[model samples]
Target: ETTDGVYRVMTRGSTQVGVGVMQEGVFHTMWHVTKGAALRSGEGRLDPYWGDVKQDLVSYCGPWKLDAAWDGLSEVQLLAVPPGERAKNIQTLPGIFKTKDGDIGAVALDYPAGTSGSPILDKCGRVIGLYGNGVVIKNGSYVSAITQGKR
Candidate 1:
């Protein structure tokens, strides 16, 4: 996978949470439940990037199906990388991560607590999992999204 087509895109919206994924040649927001208190989700894309800065991105849209495969990597796959080669082997994903619970989707990484929607990446910058509560743990068991999804 060439890094050229891959980009870390950013957008602004109502909930202070927004994230998307671009695949093949199209771009679309990931799926998320609702702000109200339901296990359901809105239409099509969730948060489209902010070319419409002032536009309220809080409204509803599609219900489109997300069939794209999550090309996440595993912990063992990354751990095998030698320290010296880590720099060139890894990539940076500013705001993105796999989904936490049920639905297939991603979250937005934001400030304060309760705002960790960003995808966690492997050394190669591949999304391996979604982020937890924004709490950073020191000695906690660290695992990739790929590995965690299976369990």
Candidate 2:
């Protein structure tokens, strides 16, 4: 479940700086520095390779479900292989807060570097967010809520 839909974000010189996830039919990843570097390195394109997702039991993270019901916060897991690693790891954390901008999900005590764009999954293995930024004060990580409009 953790390894399947995850991907490695490869930049110039075959460097893996971040991670990515495949949701629905599109590939999703952090677009700030990672995408920038990828474009600059590839001359306007980025390469994301790895992993694979489910539809019913598993879906993109959003505020609402397919049935149009509100989605609530829950304990979640951050899954990533990260840089300099061969196997993926899962961090148990809590989905703390949500806003129109993004969602704040908890991670381990230590900030997981190079884990941007990693998939955040709920207990049932449904993808609920994408790891974006690390917040030491909150002891959590910022995640992009993959809503219908945004996707």
Candidate 3:
């Protein structure tokens, strides 16, 4: 895990698995389930595209393989679909989700299940907000409030 600068960081998977950002020793995932159809595949801002969550049951913490990293587009091949908006810190991690390559906004691990929820985190990992369905999130919200772990 290394910093691309300050605004963003660069990391990779050992077996071409999910490339995530970590805080402490936790591997927080990266990927937002932007768009999908019952049976249709398309492109992002401008990259190779595919998938359909409506027909696919993408579950929690699944590994989304990285396909390519373009100028502002990051290509990833997922089992199903992922969260909406995502990034390094609290800033970019919240927002409306778009195409897979438009701006890969990974959802927090365990968050409140709803339309504008936060990504789930564990003291350091949790779900935040919902970003996978929209081409945008006009009324952005946090994934969820962090748990105290116990009480």
The C-alpha TM-scores of every prediction are 0.28, 0.56, 0.19
**For model 1, how does the per-residue alpha-carbon lDDT over 62-149 read when each residue is reduced to its tens digit?**
2222232344322312112211222112233333233564333232222322222233444455444433333233664332222122
Per-residue lDDT tens digits of candidate 2, residues 18-137?
666554534555554253232222244434332222111122222222222115544556676567776455655453446586654445423245656666666667666566544344
Per-model lDDT: 0.28, 0.47, 0.25
Instruction: Pick the lDDT winner.
Output: 2
Cα deviation in Å at residue 67, candidate 3?
Answer: 28
**Candidate 1 least-lDDT 10 residues:** 51-60
* Clashing pairs in model 2, backbone N/Cα/C closer than 3 A: 4-52, 5-52
TM-score of 3: 0.19
Prediction 1 TM-score vs. true = 0.28
> Cα lDDT of model 3 overall?
0.25
Could you tell which candidate, 1 or 3, scores higher by lDDT? 1
* TM-score ranking of the models: 2, 1, 3
Question: RMSDs, each prediction?
Answer: 12.3, 8.6, 16.0
Model 1: lDDT of residue 68? 28
